[PDB]
Design a protein around this ligand. Structure first.
Ligand SMILES: [K+]
Ligand SMILES: [K+]
Ligand SMILES: [K+]
Ligand SMILES: [K+]
Ligand SMILES: [K+]
Lengths: 82, 82, 82, 82
């Protein structure tokens, strides 16, 4: 896949994760964007995490859709900077 | 391995992790499924974690059996959506 | 590398991580083995973590030496079960 | 990329992460170095994490720049020890 397409895909993942956490769990936009990156990178500090059943289901969907997309994006970003 | 077989394997991993956490650590089915995904993806928030010796041994077995299975499943899922 | 050699290497990693956490941070042998797996798999729940400067340095050494060894071991284990 | 160049790149990542966490979040140099390794390895215990908006943005930049660099460095280090 072209690197620019990979960029769009991970951006869509970031929008999906941020808006979902914000509306479902009620955290701020900034915290929700930070949590999304922390999650799809598998860092998972746990300073923020879903506490409702709907948020838990949503988080599973983000894990399944975003961790692989983020991994490919980082590998592509390595090629353009190194 | 065919992608559909990989699907069955990760599903078996999910059943194993969910039922084990539920019966060993006593959390609800929903929390146990959420914890299983969070674990085999290596996100590991830590909002839920085993607190008994048996749960700790079980969690090691799930880590050894599920992290690799989940990684292959996500890589295959990328091929079918991208 | 032969799969059996990879097995020995990750076992040495596990011994090193368990004994170090036990003696440096003072946790039990069982907790220390559980923490070692949780760490080298990058799950990192955070229910246990080093709280002394020496434990923090030791944990960095285990992260650098064990995460790659564990990743190869899981990939090899996939070949023998799938 | 030559293994020695990869070494320099991850070292630059470590300097960037340590100084940033120290100055932005105000933790000690030692804690900040430990947190940097824990983050770029994706272990993410969560015993330390950014609590300010600026620290959250900085942490995203470190996640995007350091996780891929660290992964290549560990894979190269495996070749020189195994
Ligand atoms: K983690
Ligand atoms: K954590
Ligand atoms: K974690
Ligand atoms: K890989
Ligand atoms: K991880």
């Amino acid at each position: 896949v072209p690197a620019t397409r990979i960029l769009l895909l991970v951006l869509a993942v970031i929008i999906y994760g941020t808006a979902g956490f914000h509306f479902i769990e009620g955290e701020s936009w900034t915290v929700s964007l930070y949590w999304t990156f922390v999650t799809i990178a598998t860092v998972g500090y746990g300073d923020y995490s879903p506490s409702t059943p709907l948020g838990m289901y949503f988080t599973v969907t983000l894990i399944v859709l975003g961790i692989g997309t983020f991994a490919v994006a980082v590998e592509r970003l390595l090629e353009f900077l190194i």
